[PDB]
Amino acid sequence: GAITLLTLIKTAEHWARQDIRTIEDSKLRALLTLCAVMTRKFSKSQLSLLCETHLRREGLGQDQAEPVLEVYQRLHSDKGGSFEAALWQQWDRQSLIMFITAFLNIALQLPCESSAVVVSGLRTLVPQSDNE
Amino acid sequence: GAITLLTLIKTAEHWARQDIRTIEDSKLRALLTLCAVMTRKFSKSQLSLLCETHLRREGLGQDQAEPVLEVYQRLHSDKGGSFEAALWQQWDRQSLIMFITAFLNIALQLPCESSAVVVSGLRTLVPQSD
Numbered sequence: 367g368a369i370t371l372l373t374l375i376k377t378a379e380h381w382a383r384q385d386i387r388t389i390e391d392s393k394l395r396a397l398l399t400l401c402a403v404m405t406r407k408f409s410k411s412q413l414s415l416l417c418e419t420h421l422r423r424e425g426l427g428q429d430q431a432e433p434v435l436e437v438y439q440r441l442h443s444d445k446g447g448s449f450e451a452a453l454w455q456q457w458d459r460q461s462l463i464m465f466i467t468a469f470l471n472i473a474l475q476l477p478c479e480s481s482a483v484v485v486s487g488l489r490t491l492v493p494q495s496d497n498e
Numbered sequence: 499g500a501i502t503l504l505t506l507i508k509t510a511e512h513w514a515r516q517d518i519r520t521i522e523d524s525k526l527r528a529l530l531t532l533c534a535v536m537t538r539k540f541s542k543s544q545l546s547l548l549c550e551t552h553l554r555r556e557g558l559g560q561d562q563a564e565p566v567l568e569v570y571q572r573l574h575s576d577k578g579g580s581f582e583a584a585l586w587q588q589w590d591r592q593s594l595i596m597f598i599t600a601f602l603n604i605a606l607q608l609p610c611e612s613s614a615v616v617v618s619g620l621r622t623l624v625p626q627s628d
Contacts, residue, residue, distance in 0.1 A: 375504055488532060
């Protein structure tokens with residue numbers, strides 16, 4: 367079946383709940399692609415909030431702000447898989463695993479568009495949910 | 499609360515099924531924003547397929563390929579709402595309504611990424627469905 371937007375979301379939600387510490391290299395490489403693709407489903411103006419949420423979840427200090435943010439920025443602007451393939455080659459397994467698990471567990475809760483889009487009418491379109 | 503990726507999907511799915519022909523201007527303007535935002539959830543390499551699927555659903559001939567593709571390309575590359583606002587100003591209500599309804603009814607069925615991503619391992623991650 368087609369890899370639709372919804373299929374991506376369902377894939378991210380499944381893997382956010384897995385312990386991927388010993389997953390085979392082929393699957394970990396594919397999860398890096400999933401994180402790259404999903405980062406590009408955020409508008410560029412949300413990347414700073416992605417980074418700050420990532421830092422807070424992982425208990426990182428402001429020391430790690432610039433590095434984490436550059437990773438999200440360079441995934442967002444990547445072309446031809448260039449930066450993605452460099453991260454695979456240049457990061458150790460543990461860092462990649464921790465970054466992937468953090469991202470997948472925050473990516474589905476954070477707003478994916480910024481305020482200029484959200485506050486100018488789009489919220490009047492959002493349909494009713496449970497409980498609610 | 500947050501306008502997450504899933505919330506965007508649920509909003510598109512809801513409005514794809516509505517008859518929007520007499521919706522108030524404020525909602526039609528917001529649906530145009532939704533279409534622009536959602537176009538940017540496709541990779542640039544999928545825009546040609548979005549255009550061709552649009553043409554087939556609407557019964558348009560190959561004449562309208564270039565204009566439909568330019569619309570998708572210029573929404574995809576838009577900054578600061580510039581092209582989006584020009585579409586609102588320069589298109590008649592009927593054309594906008596038809597384009598919005600066509601897009602929302604094809605966007606949730608088409609692949610959002612191209613082959614270089616899909617065929618090199620991502621498919622092995624997709625979880626089981628009903």
